[PDB]
Enzyme design. Structure first.
Site, mmCIF file in Angstrom:
data_model
loop_
_atom_site.group_PDB
_atom_site.id
_atom_site.type_symbol
_atom_site.label_atom_id
_atom_site.label_comp_id
_atom_site.label_asym_id
_atom_site.label_seq_id
_atom_site.Cartn_x
_atom_site.Cartn_y
_atom_site.Cartn_z
ATOM 1 N N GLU A 133 -4.421 -9.970 -0.730
ATOM 2 C CA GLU A 133 -5.211 -10.113 0.468
ATOM 3 C C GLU A 133 -6.616 -10.381 0.071
ATOM 4 O O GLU A 133 -7.171 -9.650 -0.726
ATOM 5 C CB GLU A 133 -5.149 -8.853 1.324
ATOM 6 C CG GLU A 133 -3.773 -8.532 1.856
ATOM 7 C CD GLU A 133 -3.632 -7.203 2.520
ATOM 8 O OE1 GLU A 133 -4.586 -6.663 3.029
ATOM 9 O OE2 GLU A 133 -2.520 -6.732 2.521
ATOM 10 N N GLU B 102 0.773 -1.227 0.000
ATOM 11 C CA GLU B 102 0.000 0.000 0.000
ATOM 12 C C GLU B 102 0.802 1.273 0.000
ATOM 13 O O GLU B 102 0.617 2.104 0.884
ATOM 14 C CB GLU B 102 -0.920 -0.001 1.211
ATOM 15 C CG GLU B 102 -1.996 -1.063 1.146
ATOM 16 C CD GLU B 102 -2.811 -1.168 2.398
ATOM 17 O OE1 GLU B 102 -2.284 -0.908 3.454
ATOM 18 O OE2 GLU B 102 -3.970 -1.496 2.304
#
Lengths: 205, 205
Positions: free
Chosen positions: B128, B52
């Site tokens: 994820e 991220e």
């Protein structure tokens, strides 16, 4: 979509003739004369090599011939399993939206799966889908859901427009719609001639 | 999957640092030292550029650096929208199976759609997925249905293994599981520290 007049569907295996050099002259004439004839139409978007004739060397040859002569259009052919080297478009018949139908030799994947198979970069357009045999088109919405969602699902052709029925007469001179077998034709495939969205008289189902 | 210690998630925009030349030295050290350290393990399959941190030029650079130095493994990076040029694998977070989430800038497609997008040839592995926040994993079966059906859906990583809770004590000396805010830490994100498949004491949900 302009199709060459070639279908050897009843052969065993289907490509018995289309992989046989000696029939390549016959096939070539069918393709080449078609192209020469309709070359200049604007409505004609796609050339098709024909229908359900398996996949043989003659298809590969004729594919190339068209590409050579009329590079302005794309060439389509479903026989062989929708995605052989003789087609610019992955083009399958009655492939289901979310269901794979792993047939021996020529598996028929779900259209969503098909697009993603390692190496597939072509567009996918359903040669034939949604079989409108009388009281049908159940689940039609699923296709259009998918077509709108996926970029490389670019529609398809419903099978088909109009019921192929024939008029016969009763003893009172009234007319009625006849299907396979009703003329004494045997063997025949009965109601399978009628798969239209409209009736033979062009009223609508 | 061995991840470099880089996450600039709270920046605005996320790549404010990772697209800034001056931080490239800092970032490079994090990546390069990691690779040098763990280079020889057999369990390490994939290098990850971190998490991220948006998509900036520093990622592109470091991607290339790893590819140059350790060509034997593949490099993964989800930031930027799972499929930038700094990743060998389309790697997304919480992309749904059959539902597109068209976010401005970085749309999050359904994983089935994603595979087929004009030009995508990489494998797709979910960085994820399945957010196990307490009473969760609803619909987990859908992923595994899809994973088994599609060739280029090659699994993913569940988020995550163990609840990040801490033990605090009451006035009687009994222990209890604390989450964000329970140490006077403010602001905090409360229960979001606990997303495990097992409890902090390694009993299972």
């Amino acid at each position: 979509v302009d199709e060459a007049n070639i279908e050897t569907h009843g052969m065993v295996p289907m490509n018995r003739l289309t992989d046989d050099p000696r029939w390549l002259p016959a096939m070539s004439e069918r393709v080449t004369r078609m192209v020469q004839r309709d070359r200049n139409h604007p409505s004609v978007i796609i050339w098709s090599l024909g229908n359900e004739s398996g996949h043989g060397a003659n298809h590969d040859a004729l594919y190339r011939w068209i590409k050579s002569v009329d590079p302005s259009r794309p060439v389509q052919y479903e026989g062989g399993g929708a995605d052989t080297t003789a087609t610019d478009i992955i083009c399958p018949m009655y492939a289901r939206v979310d269901e794979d139908q792993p047939f021996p030799a020529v598996p028929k994947w779900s259209i969503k799966k098909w697009l993603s198979l390692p190496g597939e970069t072509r567009p996918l357009i359903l040669c034939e889908y949604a079989h409108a045999m009388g009281n049908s088109l159940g689940g039609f919405a699923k296709y259009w859901q998918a077509f709108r969602q996926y970029p490389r699902l670019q529609g398809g052709f419903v099978w088909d427009w109009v019921d192929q029925s024939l008029i016969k007469y009763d003893e009172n001179g009234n007319p009625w719609s006849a299907y396979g077998g009703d003329f004494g034709d045997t063997p025949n495939d009965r109601q399978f001639c009628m798969n239209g969205l409209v009736f033979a008289d062009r009223t609508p189902h």
